[PDB]
RNA sequence: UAAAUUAUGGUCAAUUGUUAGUAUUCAUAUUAAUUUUUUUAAAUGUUUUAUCAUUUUAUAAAGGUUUAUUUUUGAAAGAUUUUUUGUAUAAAAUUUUAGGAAUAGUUAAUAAUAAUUUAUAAUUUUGAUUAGAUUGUUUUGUUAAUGCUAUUAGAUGGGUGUGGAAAAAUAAAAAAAAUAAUUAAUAUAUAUCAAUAAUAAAUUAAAUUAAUCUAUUAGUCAGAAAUG
């Protein structure tokens, strides 16, 4: 949408693009190299501010030792430790509430977190993508059905509401006889 | 609350000394004029 | 109990302390105004509630103090106090080690 | 440290810069500072 | 704020001490317990206590 | 160019990297010079095993330093043979005197470097000789019949499809992990049994296999296997909220 | 003003060989009635 | 003026502290995610013929 | 990203019946100082009659 | 306020009638002073509706000069105060060795005054309801002042001072040792003229108006 | 870091525990002013230009700075600064239009002190009421012309003697008697 | 998915709850409370402590009426339960006598200014001269080569 | 410092090498390099010292400014 | 400290004194007629850890936040990534914002 | 016009120059620098599309500005079976120069007006217009500290008026519409103006992967140190 466009710096659309969870982190050193996690949209202008949204953490890049525990006879704690600090709650309005797109490294992240799935470029080399065919998944799910009366609830309470407010101690906002 | 530690203070001279009270002057210490009655 | 305070004699090691690395010596060590030092685990046979904590809240002022200046602008041998620091003698002679 | 000040500190004309300086009106101001002095005993006492 | 060479935010919080090789003082196995007064503890100003 | 200046990165055993002026200058002064009690070969009593693991004749071709020549302590950088294993290194007689620094590859012999000896996880001859025959003849077999099947000793073997080496842990050789410590892959097995190109045939026989017996290729039928073979008696379910 | 106009850092013994040079330098020949046991000591 | 010079040249005595050198655990990636390589395929047999390809 | 996409709402359910209880906390308590405060406005209105 | 919780248990349970007293008790007398040797009469409480203004005063004291005003001219000139002139007022005479001082009077200026008092830098003070002038009676010791020094906040008035809790909490805190020497008087927002030590034993500060010891 | 010392730096990419990065920018550099004019040639008339210029706003010094706390934040309260403006309508001329004079606060922090200071406004009045001093009240709005951004909000004292003087006939205000300061020395005989 | 969530419902150490997944914990823009940050004058959260005059008021925990209020008209419930201090209380407490008094603000207060000095009861041990590299008897061990002090 | 424009050294170029008087009660035979140089656009003349010594013909001179020496009016001195 | 105690600070002790009778003679003069509160109590028995450890069991820890391990995310995309959560490193993460931390 | 404390409550303010009768921010110091040292950079070919077309990819060249630069869903995030809405240009505070005065497509109302509509119009000494230096308002330096002294780079008119927004004639180091790729952060000698290295500067050695570098100047009357 450009007479003359940047080269390299071509995203999809539009001049202020959608939200993406980004994790930069400054070209120095590799010692001196720690990455800045946020928020922010895809066009930007040169620097990391102007369509800046939400500072999400930091991570440190290189795997730090337990030099802030005790020294265990427990392996899995005498590994080194990679560390990353996230904005939860903001990560989750920006994503889930105002749909930001999640890049791939940030992904790489989080997945490890355990608030997102591991990604798809997690990639197993080491075993092969799948076979779809109909006969097999149609045989399947007759196999095994799962009803309407489960699954009309869980879709409810996991895309919609689900502070069920206890029929029982709805009883706690019926007000008694003063006013009943 | 008083951040500045009593612990580390006074800044050394070298070997110049400098005395220091333990609890009140030497003069302000003995009071013979007045246990003994010896006043105008 | 008094705490653990940091940047004592014992503490600090040489290059902080004096100006020039000294050996760790065990064994000997004069300059710390020390005879011997048999070196057990730091926290084991003290007891447990003496060890009360760590102390650094205040100017290593042996080592680095605010505001520097030269104590005496004449001559020019003198530095803030915080520069003590032997001579430097003409080219180094080094013995062999036995 | 002639007197025994272990907590003290006198500052005379600013800066080394600022004239009159010399060895003569340094121990003199600083003399008369220490003079000028009232203890806290004193201080108080003065006070009722 | 971020990713310029200045980068405060990351710093803006607080992040454990990251010695995983010499970033200058021998970081990864010199273990620095007065290094980190004398040194790494932000000051008040040059030479006053660590704050 | 410029980058000849970026310092050799430094991990979490090495301790002064000695790259700059007064980096060197206050340890260069140290002139070293071998008396008859810096004479490690009069010290045979106590560190045998340090006299019979110097390469002598890599040291003194390559060196000019002489098996007479070295120190207890000596701070020079010469080779060594491992006399467990048999791997080459250039070690300094300082970092394993004063450290019992060695054979990178003999450094995980032991399952695991925090409780080394502890593990009761079984040997290699007395457990499996299967992969006694398939490790590389080193004439210490001896004694490496004796290493823990958790060993993450990057051991040398014979392949059976290419016959060539591959270098692969003992652990991930074997398979089995001492309780409690970073577990390996289900099929480390499967992909390991074989050389770093010639363990791909190996696998993808029994994953065509259900392509074909399916018509469908989908990684969910191990899965599958196990809630079909292994039904959960009593779990405990946590009581619901909702 | 500036030090080094009209000629540079006088390189003068720069090395100072004198603090060095021990022509009388005590050998095998120690006194065994003023060195040590050891013969390194004084 | 300052046409002189630093007032300290303020070092640090390096000192090895036995934690840091204390023996870490590891397990290469090799060890949880098997590496190994796609012996050669008919249309790309030769490591000629790849880089032909690519 | 079905996954993915289940997640995105997931996380509308999470972050919603999160900011419901917690405005309606943050006015339990803005509301006692919102009172509070219209009080004393109330009272230092008397005292300066 | 623990001195009052078992100091006021008195009430019978009764809410009782309020007992009617002499025509007069609750009145506040006045402070004695002398008629026929004196600074200014003491005038009485009855003719307060016969008091003026610092600014603008009656006519009361004929026998007795009146202090004036203190407004500058131009923009060059600092706005002095009646808390500046009642400091150099004092500073001058305890400079002259002086005993009563007819020392200027508004609020803050008696405000200071009374703390001053309370603070021992003053033998005594008395506010003749004169709506200008009142007087202050000086303390001396071994010769000197016990005012050794007292400053205004300002030398100026269109600059007001006011001062941060932790300003007036860095005073009484030199280098380690609580120091409630020099009294510091501010005036807070509640209308109050106190020292810095019951201005930060509440939290509160004030404008700046003197410092003194 | 900032808070380290020249000697005791060693890497000025991180910042190790913690601190204000930022670069320590080079104030001291002897900035110069090269006269390319003489003391008699300018080619300006009113303000010579003879030696270097403190550049800024918001940064020139004495340091002048916005303070919103002034007589309208004592009157009002506003949703943006300079709202509500209230002032001695002065000038009106233009037909249906009104120019109000009112003040700010420019807090000089250095000093510890303020000065308010002046500015005539432009301020729609439909229907034409206000006199030159009628003490008014100016709100803003949506734009009313180039340069009218305001109208009249109220009035808060009509100058009646004014309302009378027009009734009368009279101008409701004589004009200033001289002119702008001027350099020439007009003589004006009878 | 199905497949998945059988084996996941088959995992024993599954049905836990990972709270990083499971709430937005404050999901609003602003904290549960002021947190160290400065104050009117700039008093950094450390030079500060919230509940001081700084904050929002806290009203009049009554009501403020006109004329015929408290003054004599009759009384509240704050006039029945208030006590007159001879009859006793209505249920037994032990209270002690010595806090009994401390509440009342009628003990004879012990505070700590009127604590003497801490006398050094026992002398501690003579301090010998321990010796320096500034108590050498030969100024050639302390020459500038070897001694830059006496430690 | 007016014509070391604020640059720490200034470079210019030699024109004459006269000899100037110092100022009592100091004597001596001063010399004092009529130097040159341009810069923005103007083309400038520089009356300096010299301190430094002189071996091959270099019009190349780095002027840096001194102190005051005993000859009145010469602000600049060679490096 | 340097406060300076008005000329009559002590008449609010002083009558409290001259008032304040005592049961019997041990209760007027005790020596912990001074220890008011708990910190006056562990500011006297804090040299004395044999009584301190008795007397305040709380400064003395016993109990802590156990190490809990979660149940884990489950994946849709089965086995095809279930090494992806697994590495030879611990990940540790601290969540942020404006409220936490 | 009352003292009070249930005893350090709310977390560190603190100024280190050898002068030369005396008055006075004013040579010599120290701090931050600059002068000064190659451990941060770097490459060319943007990429799809149905095709001589078209969908996607919008503020670093300067341009000299001190009453100044301000704006949205309709693009996109972005989810359905259809026609679906009212949130935007405005401002407001701060503006330099020794000797200081006049400036101009003009001000307001009408207006979807008037290249010749109406008028006592508007800017200014509360410092206007011209001209001059200058990038504009959380980044520094010093100082115990009000201060004093700093911060970059980005918007330089309209002319077929495309697009959501003209910001659009080459100057990332953002994966850019199929998971390419991350076993990767390394980048050769190429550059901009950033980015303070002399990293134990001199006897005991580097649990390394053995990688770059051979390492130096000052003074010598005052005042550390002098004679030929
Ligand atoms: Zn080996
Ligand atoms: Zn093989």
């Given at each position: 949408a450009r007479a003359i466009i940047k080269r390299r710096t071509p995203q999809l659309w539009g001049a202020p693009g959608a939200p993406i969870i980004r994790m930069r982190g400054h070209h120095v050193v590799?010692?001196?190299?720690?990455?800045?996690?946020?928020?922010?949209?895809?066009?930007?202008?040169?620097?990391?501010?102007?369509?800046?949204?939400?500072?999400?953490?930091?991570?440190?890049?290189?795997?730090?030792?337990?030099?802030?525990?005790?020294?265990?006879?427990?392996?899995?704690?005498?590994?080194?430790?990679?560390?990353?600090?996230?904005?939860?709650?903001?990560?989750?309005?920006?994503?889930?509430?105002?749909?930001?797109?999640?890049?791939?490294?940030?992904?790489?992240?989080?997945?490890?977190?355990?608030?997102?799935?591991?990604?798809?470029?997690?990639?197993?080399?080491?075993?092969?993508?799948?076979?779809?065919?109909?006969?097999?998944?149609?045989?399947?799910?007759?196999?095994?059905?799962?009803?309407?009366?489960?699954?009309?609830?869980?879709?409810?309470?996991?895309?919609?509401?689900?502070?069920?407010?206890?029929?029982?101690?709805?009883?706690?906002?019926?007000?008694?006889?003063?006013?009943? | 609350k008083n951040l500045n530690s009593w612990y580390a203070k006074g800044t050394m001279r070298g070997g110049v000394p400098r005395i220091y009270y333990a609890w009140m002057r030497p003069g302000s210490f003995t009071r013979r004029r007045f246990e003994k009655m010896r006043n105008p | 109990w008094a705490p653990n305070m940091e940047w004592g004699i014992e503490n600090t090691?040489?290059?902080?302390?004096?100006?020039?690395?000294?050996?760790?010596?065990?064994?000997?060590?004069?300059?710390?105004?020390?005879?011997?030092?048999?070196?057990?685990?730091?926290?084991?046979?003290?007891?447990?509630?003496?060890?009360?904590?760590?102390?650094?809240?205040?100017?290593?002022?042996?080592?680095?103090?605010?505001?520097?200046?030269?104590?005496?602008?004449?001559?020019?041998?003198?530095?803030?106090?915080?520069?003590?620091?032997?001579?430097?003698?003409?080219?180094?002679?080094?013995?062999?080690?036995? | 440290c002639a007197f025994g000040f272990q907590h003290a500190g006198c500052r005379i004309n600013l800066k080394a810069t600022n004239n009159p300086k010399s060895p003569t009106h340094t121990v003199e101001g600083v003399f008369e500072a220490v003079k000028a002095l009232r203890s806290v005993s004193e201080i108080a006492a003065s006070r009722g | 704020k971020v990713d310029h060479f200045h980068?405060?935010?990351?710093?803006?919080?607080?992040?454990?001490?990251?010695?995983?090789?010499?970033?200058?003082?021998?970081?990864?196995?010199?273990?620095?317990?007065?290094?980190?007064?004398?040194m790494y503890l932000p000051k008040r100003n040059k030479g006053t206590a660590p704050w | 160019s410029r980058w000849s200046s970026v310092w050799p990165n430094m991990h979490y055993g090495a301790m002064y990297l000695s790259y700059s002026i007064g980096r060197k200058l206050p340890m260069k002064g140290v002139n070293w010079v071998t008396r008859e009690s810096n004479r490690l070969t009069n010290f045979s009593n106590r560190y045998q095993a340090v006299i019979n693991d110097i390469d002598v004749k890599k040291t003194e071709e390559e060196l000019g330093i002489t098996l007479q020549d070295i120190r207890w302590n000596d701070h020079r950088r010469i080779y060594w043979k491992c006399s467990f294993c048999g791997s080459s290194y250039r070690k300094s007689v300082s970092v394993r005197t004063k450290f019992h620094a060695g054979c990178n590859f003999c450094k995980g012999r032991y399952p695991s470097e925090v409780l080394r000896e502890q593990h009761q996880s079984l040997s290699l001859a007395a457990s499996a000789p299967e992969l006694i025959k398939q490790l590389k003849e080193t004439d210490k077999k001896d004694n490496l019949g004796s290493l823990a099947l958790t060993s993450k000793f990057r051991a040398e073997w014979k392949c059976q499809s290419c016959g060539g080496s591959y270098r692969a842990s003992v652990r991930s050789r074997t398979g089995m992990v001492e309780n409690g410590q970073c577990p390996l892959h289900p099929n480390i097995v499967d992909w390991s049994a074989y050389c770093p190109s010639c363990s791909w045939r190996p696998n993808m026989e029994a994953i065509a296999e259900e392509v074909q017996r399916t018509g469908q290729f989908l990684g969910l039928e191990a899965e599958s296997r196990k809630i079909a073979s292994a039904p959960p008696a009593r779990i405990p379910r946590r009581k619901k909220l909702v | 003003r500036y030090p080094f106009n009209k000629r540079g850092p006088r390189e003068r013994k720069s090395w100072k060989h004198h603090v060095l040079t021990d022509p009388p330098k005590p050998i095998q020949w120690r006194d065994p009635k003023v060195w040590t046991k050891d013969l390194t000591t004084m | 003026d300052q046409t002189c010079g630093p007032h300290k040249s303020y070092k640090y005595t390096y000192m090895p502290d036995p934690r840091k050198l204390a023996p870490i655990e590891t397990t290469t990636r090799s060890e949880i995610l098997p590496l190994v390589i796609r012996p050669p395929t008919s249309y790309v047999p030769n490591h000629e013929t790849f880089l032909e390809k690519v | 990203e079905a996954q993915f996409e289940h997640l995105r709402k997931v996380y509308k359910r999470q972050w919603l019946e999160s900011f419901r209880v917690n405005a309606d906390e943050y006015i339990y308590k803005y509301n006692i100082t919102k009172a509070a405060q219209l009080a004393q406005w109330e009272y230092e209105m008397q005292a300066q009659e | 306020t623990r001195l009052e919780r078992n100091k006021a248990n008195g009430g019978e349970a009764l809410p009782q009638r309020r007992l009617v007293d002499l025509p007069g008790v609750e009145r506040r007398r006045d402070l004695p002073a002398?008629?026929?040797?004196?600074?200014?009469?003491?005038?009485?409480?009855?003719?307060?509706?016969?008091?003026?203004?610092?600014?603008?005063?009656?006519?009361?004291?004929?026998?007795?000069?009146?202090?004036?005003?203190?407004?500058?001219?131009?923009?060059?000139?600092?706005?002095?105060?009646?808390?500046?002139?009642?400091?150099?007022?004092?500073?001058?005479?305890?400079?002259?060795?002086?005993?009563?001082?007819?020392?200027?009077?508004?609020?803050?200026?008696?405000?200071?005054?009374?703390?001053?008092?309370?603070?021992?830098?003053?033998?005594?003070?008395?506010?003749?309801?004169?709506?200008?002038?009142?007087?202050?009676?000086?303390?001396?010791?071994?010769?000197?002042?016990?005012?050794?020094?007292?400053?205004?906040?300002?030398?100026?008035?269109?600059?007001?001072?006011?001062?941060?809790?932790?300003?007036?909490?860095?005073?009484?805190?030199?280098?380690?040792?609580?120091?409630?020497?020099?009294?510091?008087?501010?005036?807070?927002?509640?209308?109050?003229?106190?020292?810095?030590?019951?201005?930060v034993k509440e939290n509160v500060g004030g404008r700046g108006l003197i410092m003194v010891h | 870091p900032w808070w380290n010392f020249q000697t005791e730096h060693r890497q000025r990419c991180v910042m190790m525990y913690g601190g204000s990065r930022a670069k320590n920018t080079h104030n001291a550099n002897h900035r110069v002013f090269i006269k390319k004019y003489k003391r008699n040639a300018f080619p300006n008339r009113?303000?010579?230009?003879?030696?270097?210029?403190?550049?800024?706003?918001?940064?020139?010094?004495?340091?002048?700075?916005?303070?919103?706390?002034?007589?309208?934040?004592?009157?009002?309260?506003?949703?943006?600064?300079?709202?509500?403006?209230?002032?001695?309508?002065?000038?009106?001329?233009?037909?249906?239009?009104?120019?109000?004079?009112?003040?700010?606060?420019?807090?000089?922090?250095?000093?510890?002190?303020?000065?308010?200071?002046?500015?005539?406004?432009?301020?729609?009045?439909?229907?034409?009421?206000?006199?030159?001093?009628?003490?008014?009240?100016?709100?803003?709005?949506?734009?009313?012309?180039?340069?009218?951004?305001?109208?009249?909000?109220?009035?808060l004292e009509p100058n009646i003697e004014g309302r009378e003087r027009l009734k009368l006939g009279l101008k409701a205000v004589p004009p200033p008697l001289f002119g702008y300061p001027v350099s020439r020395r007009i003589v004006k005989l009878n | 998915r199905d497949v998945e969530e059988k084996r996941h419902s088959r995992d024993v150490v599954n049905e836990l709850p990972n709270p990083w997944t499971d709430y937005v914990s404050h999901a609003l823009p602003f904290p549960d409370r002021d947190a160290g940050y400065p104050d009117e004058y700039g008093d950094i959260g450390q030079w500060r402590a919230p509940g001081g005059p700084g904050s929002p008021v806290k009203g009049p925990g009554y009501y403020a009426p006109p004329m015929e209020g408290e003054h004599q008209r009759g009384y509240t419930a704050e006039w029945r339960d208030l006590k007159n201090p001879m009859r006793p209380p209505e249920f037994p407490t032990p209270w002690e006598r010595k806090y009994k008094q401390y509440a009342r603000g009628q003990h004879p207060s012990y505070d700590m200014v009127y604590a003497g000095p801490m006398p050094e009861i026992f002398p501690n041990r003579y301090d010998f001269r321990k010796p320096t590299r500034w108590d050498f008897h030969d100024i050639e061990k302390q020459g500038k080569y070897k001694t830059s002090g006496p430690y | 410092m007016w014509f070391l424009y604020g640059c720490c050294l200034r470079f210019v170029l030699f024109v004459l090498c006269y000899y100037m008087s110092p100022r009592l009660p100091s004597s001596g035979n001063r010399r004092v390099l009529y130097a040159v140089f341009y810069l923005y656009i103007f083309v400038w003349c520089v009356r300096c010292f010299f301190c430094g010594i002189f071996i091959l013909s270099f019009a190349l001179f780095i002027i840096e400014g001194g102190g005051f020496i005993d000859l009145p009016g010469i602000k600049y001195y060679t490096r | 400290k340097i406060t300076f105690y008005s000329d009559r600070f002590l008449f609010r002790d002083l009558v409290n004194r001259r008032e304040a009778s005592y049961a019997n003679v041990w209760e007027m003069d005790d020596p912990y007629r001074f220890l008011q509160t708990e910190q006056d109590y562990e500011d006297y028995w804090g040299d004395n850890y044999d009584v301190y450890r008795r007397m305040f069991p709380e400064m003395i820890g016993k109990s802590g936040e156990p190490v809990q391990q979660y149940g884990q995310m489950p994946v849709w995309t089965g086995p095809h990534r279930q090494h992806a959560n697994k590495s030879q490193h611990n990940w540790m993460f601290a969540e942020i914002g404006v409220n936490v931390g």
């Open positions: 590799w010692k001196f190299q720690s990455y800045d996690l946020f928020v922010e949209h895809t066009h930007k202008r040169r620097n990391s501010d102007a369509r800046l949204l939400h500072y999400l953490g930091k991570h440190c890049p290189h795997p730090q030792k337990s030099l802030w525990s005790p020294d265990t006879p427990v392996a899995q704690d005498r590994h080194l430790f990679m560390l990353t600090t996230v904005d939860v709650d903001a990560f989750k309005y920006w994503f889930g509430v105002k749909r930001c797109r999640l890049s791939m490294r940030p992904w790489a992240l989080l997945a490890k977190a355990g608030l997102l799935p591991p990604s798809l470029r997690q990639n197993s080399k080491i075993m092969p993508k799948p076979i779809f065919d109909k006969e097999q998944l149609m045989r399947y799910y007759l196999a095994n059905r799962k009803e309407e009366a489960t699954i009309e609830r869980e879709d409810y309470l996991n895309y919609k509401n689900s502070l069920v407010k206890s029929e029982e101690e709805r009883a706690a906002e019926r007000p008694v006889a003063p006013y009943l | - | 090691p040489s290059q902080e302390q004096y100006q020039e690395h000294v050996p760790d010596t065990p064994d000997a060590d004069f300059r710390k105004q020390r005879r011997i030092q048999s070196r057990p685990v730091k926290w084991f046979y003290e007891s447990h509630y003496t060890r009360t904590g760590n102390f650094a809240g205040f100017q290593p002022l042996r080592f680095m103090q605010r505001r520097t200046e030269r104590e005496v602008r004449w001559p020019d041998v003198i530095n803030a106090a915080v520069q003590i620091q032997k001579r430097k003698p003409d080219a180094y002679i080094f013995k062999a080690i036995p | - | 980068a405060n935010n990351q710093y803006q919080h607080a992040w454990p001490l990251l010695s995983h090789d010499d970033l200058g003082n021998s970081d990864q196995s010199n273990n620095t317990r007065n290094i980190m007064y004398s | - | - | - | - | 002398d008629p026929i040797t004196r600074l200014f009469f003491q005038h009485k409480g009855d003719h307060a509706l016969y008091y003026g203004t610092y600014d603008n005063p009656s006519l009361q004291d004929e026998d007795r000069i009146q202090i004036e005003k203190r407004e500058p001219r131009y923009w060059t000139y600092n706005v002095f105060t009646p808390v500046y002139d009642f400091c150099h007022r004092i500073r001058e005479a305890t400079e002259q060795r002086k005993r009563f001082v007819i020392v200027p009077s508004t609020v803050e200026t008696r405000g200071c005054a009374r703390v001053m008092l309370g603070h021992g830098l003053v033998a005594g003070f008395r506010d003749f309801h004169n709506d200008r002038a009142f007087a202050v009676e000086l303390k001396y010791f071994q010769g000197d002042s016990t005012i050794n020094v007292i400053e205004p906040c300002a030398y100026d008035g269109k600059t007001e001072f006011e001062w941060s809790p932790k300003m007036m909490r860095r005073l009484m805190n030199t280098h380690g040792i609580h120091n409630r020497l020099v009294v510091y008087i501010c005036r807070t927002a509640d209308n109050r003229v106190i020292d810095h030590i019951q201005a | 009113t303000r010579h230009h003879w030696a270097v210029s403190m550049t800024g706003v918001l940064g020139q010094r004495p340091r002048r700075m916005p303070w919103p706390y002034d007589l309208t934040s004592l009157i009002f309260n506003q949703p943006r600064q300079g709202s509500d403006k209230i002032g001695y309508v002065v000038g009106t001329s233009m037909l249906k239009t009104a120019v109000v004079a009112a003040n700010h606060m420019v807090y000089y922090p250095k000093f510890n002190q303020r000065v308010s200071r002046t500015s005539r406004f432009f301020a729609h009045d439909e229907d034409l009421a206000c006199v030159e001093g009628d003490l008014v009240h100016i709100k803003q709005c949506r734009k009313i012309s180039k340069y009218k951004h305001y109208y009249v909000f109220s009035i | - | - | -």
